[PDB]
Amino acid sequence: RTIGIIGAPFSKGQPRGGVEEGPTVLRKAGLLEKLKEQECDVKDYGDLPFADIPNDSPFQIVKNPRSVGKASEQLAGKVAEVKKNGRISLVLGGDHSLAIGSISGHARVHPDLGVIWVDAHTDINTPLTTTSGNLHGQPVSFLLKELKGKIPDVPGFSWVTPCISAKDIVYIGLRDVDPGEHYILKTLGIKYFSMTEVDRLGIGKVMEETLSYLLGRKKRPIHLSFDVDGLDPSFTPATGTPVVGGLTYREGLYITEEIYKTGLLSGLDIMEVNPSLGKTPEEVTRTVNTAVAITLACFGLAREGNHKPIDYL
Amino acid sequence: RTIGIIGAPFSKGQPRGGVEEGPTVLRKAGLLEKLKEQECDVKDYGDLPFADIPNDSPFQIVKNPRSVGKASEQLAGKVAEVKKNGRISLVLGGDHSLAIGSISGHARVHPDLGVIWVDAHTDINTPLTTTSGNLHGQPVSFLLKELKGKIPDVPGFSWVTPCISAKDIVYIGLRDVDPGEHYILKTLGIKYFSMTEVDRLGIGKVMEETLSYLLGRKKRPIHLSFDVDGLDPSFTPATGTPVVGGLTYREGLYITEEIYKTGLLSGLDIMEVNPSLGKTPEEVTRTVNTAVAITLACFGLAREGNHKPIDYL
Amino acid sequence: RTIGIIGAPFSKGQPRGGVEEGPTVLRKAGLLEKLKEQECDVKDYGDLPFADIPNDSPFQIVKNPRSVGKASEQLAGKVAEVKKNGRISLVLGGDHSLAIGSISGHARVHPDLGVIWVDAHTDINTPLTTTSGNLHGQPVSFLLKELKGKIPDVPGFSWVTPCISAKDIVYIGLRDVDPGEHYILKTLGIKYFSMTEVDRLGIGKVMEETLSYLLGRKKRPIHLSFDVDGLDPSFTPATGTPVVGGLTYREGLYITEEIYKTGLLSGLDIMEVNPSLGKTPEEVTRTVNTAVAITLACFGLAREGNHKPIDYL
Ligand SMILES: N=C(NO)NCC[C@H](N)C(=O)O
Ligand SMILES: N=C(NO)NCC[C@H](N)C(=O)O
Ligand SMILES: N=C(NO)NCC[C@H](N)C(=O)O
Ligand SMILES: [Mn+2]
Ligand SMILES: [Mn+2]
Ligand SMILES: [Mn+2]
Ligand SMILES: [Mn+2]
Ligand SMILES: [Mn+2]
Ligand SMILES: [Mn+2]
Incomplete structure (x- = not known):
């Protein structure tokens, strides 16, 4: 359909910095051109300018909470706009913590959306179950309604509002899930196809x-x-x-x-x-x-x- | 069963020359010996001596039409002979344009044959749909009866006569099909299993x-x-x-x-x-x-x- | 369940010597620690001290028969003990000829066991069908009851007693089976899933x-x-x-x-x-x-x- 490209050069959801170059290398590979080479109407909304937040000490174990929370808040706004323009939002990351803003903004315009999460990880740790403190491994916990109440008030995310239910998401490709994440999976009855299910079926x-x-x-x-x-x-x-x-x-x-x-x-x-x-x-x-x-x-x-x-x- | 090896050191169906060494390296790998090591009766008909055609300018966009057409004409004859000797013809290529002669010669002795084409490509471009001009990407268009009338009179192929119908062939492995080729696929109702079907089934x-x-x-x-x-x-x-x-x-x-x-x-x-x-x-x-x-x-x-x-x- | 680790640094079932280091590198990789990191009760029975047998000339074509036979005899004893201690025996090899002792010792405590053999080979050659003379390609022939009578009296194996029937074993992964081995497969009706069956199903x-x-x-x-x-x-x-x-x-x-x-x-x-x-x-x-x-x-x-x-x- 019609596409709305959004660059999200953000890395603070995890430790390695090079991920904020994702938009750059993907565009340099001719993604916009290739898309147009197809029956695709593409509009580049550019790369979101993620302002620097110098003062951002950890919330308990959670790292760069304000930088991550603000980046997702900014992205949520841009995604909601592109969706309102009747275009399929294409977010080029960037670490996965950005999923919080992308899915949040998407749900503002389309509250009945369903999510397919392709990943080796479930990224459903809460700020309290995580052992790494990296927010790119927690995006899903912030989005699930059933978990609102298990998510502490982390600086930078007061704008978040759980927009999907456990039954509105399906995981595919799982092969490295933390104990707490697996507990949530089974407890909430989330539908998943780990690499084991892919091998089986x-x-x-x-x-x-x-x-x-x-x-x-x-x-x-x-x-x-x-x-x-x-x-x-x-x-x-x-x-x-x-x-x-x-x-x-x-x-x-x-x-x-x-x-x-x-x-x-x-x-x-x-x-x-x-x-x-x-x-x-x-x-x-x-x-x-x-x-x-x-x-x-x-x-x-x-x-x-x-x-x-x-x-x- | 009984085998009849035919070497086809030909490369003019495409740009890179090294492919005419195929017969050489395959034989050097001990193919005849390995086949005999099995319950196989093998007769090597040698490598077909493909004479040089110095004067062979392009027919429109199509390159080396006379060299390709003659090579397939020569191969068709050799294949028909080996088939008449009651042997399974094994053609060592060589670029795929040779399929024109191999399938043509095979059909002279066995008009009711069925073809299984294993390839990433459909090689069904006509002299008019091709954008590369390389004949190794057009062999199938010369063989299909339903397309006779869409194939111009290209120098070197006046000997050809469409020997198979759209329903006598099955493709397996497709993953790089040109637009026109896909149009022919759907238009003639050709049976295929692209990599997508292989993944699915x-x-x-x-x-x-x-x-x-x-x-x-x-x-x-x-x-x-x-x-x-x-x-x-x-x-x-x-x-x-x-x-x-x-x-x-x-x-x-x-x-x-x-x-x-x-x-x-x-x-x-x-x-x-x-x-x-x-x-x-x-x-x-x-x-x-x-x-x-x-x-x-x-x-x-x-x-x-x-x-x-x-x-x- | 509860585990009993047994190191079997033995290589004389085949020509290359480095395989006797298997236990060493596997332990050095933190296998015991990783197992304990799980709900596993692990007891290391150490590496079996396989005494050197200087005088061990071939029995016909079969190499190091006494060294192999004794190593399996020693292992059979250790496995039977760990099984008697109510633990799942984990044998770290070592070449596959050791299977003779591992399965033999296991069957002393649990005669009704079933075997799943994951391998590219069937290792079911007898001392008379083998062409390599390497005992790691014959362990199964020594264990099958239906073959007792086709196994000569090889020095070092007088202690062996066929403990499983053709129907108590399943092969998975086969892709390099010798002619005689295939004959035994079909003759005894052994259940197998070669790579061909894995591809099919x-x-x-x-x-x-x-x-x-x-x-x-x-x-x-x-x-x-x-x-x-x-x-x-x-x-x-x-x-x-x-x-x-x-x-x-x-x-x-x-x-x-x-x-x-x-x-x-x-x-x-x-x-x-x-x-x-x-x-x-x-x-x-x-x-x-x-x-x-x-x-x-x-x-x-x-x-x-x-x-x-x-x-x-
Ligand atoms: N790249 C990812 N997920 O996609 N890392 C997450 C790893 C780990 N589960 C955590 O919470 O830190
Ligand atoms: N190697 C192959 N086919 O097997 N190339 C064909 C590519 C392209 N479809 C063409 O007509 O030139
Ligand atoms: N590594 C193995 N089997 O696992 N080799 C066996 C090879 C051959 N079949 C033989 O009997 O010598
Ligand atoms: Mn992720
Ligand atoms: Mn991941
Ligand atoms: Mn081809
Ligand atoms: Mn091809
Ligand atoms: Mn083996
Ligand atoms: Mn093996």
Whole structure:
């Protein structure tokens, strides 16, 4: 459909700084051009200027709470605008803590949205269950209504308001979940397909079940938050926390081709691309190239081929 | 069954020259010996001496039309002979434009043949839809009856006569199809399993459907045209146009083991192996070794093991 | 459950010596610590001191028969003890010939055990069918009751007594089976899932069928003999006889996660890890790291996550 690109050069949700270059390398790879090369109407809303917050000491164990909270607050506003302009928001990250603002802004315009979270992690730790203190591993806890009451008043997030229920989200690709996160998973009855379920059923059945689970009762807007470390590091090595045994390039493209075909993609996040972590220049291009491929699939690029509504013969 | 090896050291169907060494490196890898090590009766018809055609300017955008057309005409003759000798033709390429002659010669003796095309590409561009002008991306358009009338009179192909119908061919492995090619696919109702279908159904279901689609009504001779770039470049890197997200080594062996089990393999093509494109000596041996493995599976080599009709205990 | 670690630094079942360092590198990787980090009660029975047998000339073609036979005899005793102590035996190899002693000792305490053999090889050659003479490719022939009578009196194995029937074992991962071995497979009706069956059905169906085949009639103790070369060499390169087209990291973890869930794991073997064969230091850590991952899955480590029986919120 119509696209609204939003750059989110933010890294304070985790320790490694290079992730704020994600928007830069993705654009430099010709993402806007490639999208236009397709039947896509693209409007670049530019990179959000995330002001520096010098005074931002930890809230207990949680690091850079004000910087993270403000960045998501700013992003939520931009996403809500692009959604109001009738465009599918495409947020280029940036660490995953930004999901808080992206999904929040998306839900302001489309409260009935459903979320598909592709990631090796659940990122559902609360400020009290986290052991790392990195906010990119907590975005989901801030968004779930069932958890409001388990989230302390962390500086920078007073603007947040839980917008989704445990049943409005599906996880795909999980392979490194913390104990508390697993407890929340089972306690709230969240639907997930860890790498174990992908191995058992095959990605085809996984997507069939995912889309049926989220669109069964009725059709609703879909928000896809894609963490590049959800895919195996043999495809996306330049990322902060890679975990072996990931989703293949093919599975990544399958997930997105299927989501595109629903015609319900409403919001998209391409997160955790960190060029500074590429062991080689090739590891960087390999990661960025895969990230672009996944993005293009979300907007119609199909492996069986594509053609214009004309008679080619 | 009984085998008839035919070397086709030809490269003019595309730009990179090293592909004409395919027969050489495949034989040097001990292909004939390995085949004989099995219950295989092998006769080497040698490498076809493709005469040089100095005067061969492009037909519009199409390059080396006379060289390509003549090479396929010569090959068609050799294949028809080996088929008449009651042997399964094994053509070692060489670029894929040779498929025109291999399938044409095969159909002269067995007009009811069915084709399984393993490739990342459909190679069904016509001389008028192609944008590259490389004939290795057009062989199928010359063979389909439904397209006769959309193929101009290109110098070197006046001998061609469409021998198969849209319904006599199945594609497996597609992941880089041109717009016009996709239009032809949908327009003629051609059966295909792109990498998307392989991901969705699994290679087992894909082969079950492929063989049922082609052998359902009745048993008929099978022609397998195997383009090595159909497999992922992590297995066959030394090829002209590699595309990531390909068929795995295992899937390649599965396809061929299943085709062998039909007992209907009649013609085989092992194409696009280009040693000159191996970034390293290991990339070359890796490509050639995989090509040999695929070939041996076509003739009985099974992963579960093989044994003679004797009492080993 | 409760674990009993047994080190088996033995290599004489094959030619390459570095495999006797397996216990060392696996322990150095923190296996005991990692296991304890889980709900696991671990007791290290140390490394069995395999005395040197200077006089050990070949029995016909069979090499180091006395050294191999004695090593398995010693291991059988240790395994029987750990089993009597109510612990799941975890044997760190060492070449696979040790399976003779591990399964023999296990069956002394649990005669109704069932065996799942993960390997690229069947290791079911008899002293008379083998062409290599390496005993690590014959362990299964010594254990099968149906073959007692086809096994000559080899020096060092007079203590052996066939403890399992052809129907008490299932193979997974086969891709390099000798002719005689295949003859035995078909002759005795042994249940196997070669890489061809894994491709056809998917690992989920494979495990479903495997566990149903072995636990259908009734629940019984399970012995898992895991040869690391069962997995693709892209995951476990430091091994004596690697064969491409192997089980993936994910499939390896799936097999073991499923076996763990049965709650019937009784005996485990982690064999063929040879650090000396790692082309690089990274190939060594890659092999050892994968071996540890497989082991941890056998004892509860799940990809969807794990959590204590407490309220994390
Ligand atoms: N990159 C990620 N998630 O996507 N890291 C999260 C890791 C860990 N679970 C935490 O809370 O710190
Ligand atoms: N190697 C191949 N096909 O197998 N190249 C074909 C590419 C392109 N579709 C063309 O017509 O030029
Ligand atoms: N590493 C192994 N098996 O696990 N080698 C066995 C090879 C061969 N089948 C033999 O009997 O020598
Ligand atoms: Mn992640
Ligand atoms: Mn994440
Ligand atoms: Mn191709
Ligand atoms: Mn081709
Ligand atoms: Mn083995
Ligand atoms: Mn073995």
